[PDB]
Design a protein around this ligand. Structure first.
Ligand code: HEM
Length: 153
């Protein structure tokens, strides 16, 4: 469990992400795709993109980054009481999009890196530790749903 102090660190940095949801979202997806090119192949929508400049120029990619971060923010603001928000996401990602849990680890690393880049004053080691713990909780709960449905591996 995260303590209340740990959740406060998470949500204090998240409030700053919300000042520029589209810019953060774009940066996170591009870092994922560049660091782990296998992930791009899961997106029929985006797999025509071949350079960082092309990724940065895509309005549709920017729009999807907003969708991703909006959903993640709604989960974080539940402070662990996220069953209703998380279940539908797990179901779509396991059974429709066919995303392995390992790729959820990769996007978690991309989020942490981008937050460090953009918010160094509010994203010290104590806040990095708290954010890691929040994203671990997210992954643990998705993995349980995957296991029920026959997708943990
Ligand atoms: C923080 C983690 C993630 C969040 C919050 C998230 C959220 C979402 C949301 C809200 C949607 C649209 C509704 C839906 O289809 O369920 C979506 C679509 C999708 N997600 Fe994710 N996602 C995450 C990670 C991933 C990862 C790591 C991958 C692939 C490597 C992925 C692949 C997809 C695909 C392929 C779609 C459909 C896109 C389209 O064709 O419009 N997601 N995701």
């Amino acid at each position: 469990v995260l303590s209340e102090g740990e959740w406060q660190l998470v949500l204090h940095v998240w409030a700053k992400v919300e000042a520029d949801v589209a810019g953060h979202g774009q940066d996170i997806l591009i870092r994922l795709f560049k660091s782990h090119p296998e992930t791009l192949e899961k997106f029929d929508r985006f797999k025509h993109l071949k350079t960082e400049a092309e990724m940065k120029a895509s309005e549709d990619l920017k729009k999807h980054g907003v969708t991703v971060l909006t959903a993640l923010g709604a989960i974080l603001k539940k402070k662990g009481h996220h069953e209703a928000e998380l279940k539908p996401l797990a179901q779509s990602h396991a059974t429709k999009h066919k995303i392995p849990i390992k790729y959820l680890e990769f996007i978690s690393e991309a989020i942490i890196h981008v937050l460090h880049s953009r918010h160094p004053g509010d994203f010290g080691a104590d806040a990095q530790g708290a954010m890691n713990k929040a994203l671990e909780l997210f992954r643990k709960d998705i993995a349980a749903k995957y296991k029920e449905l026959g997708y943990q591996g």
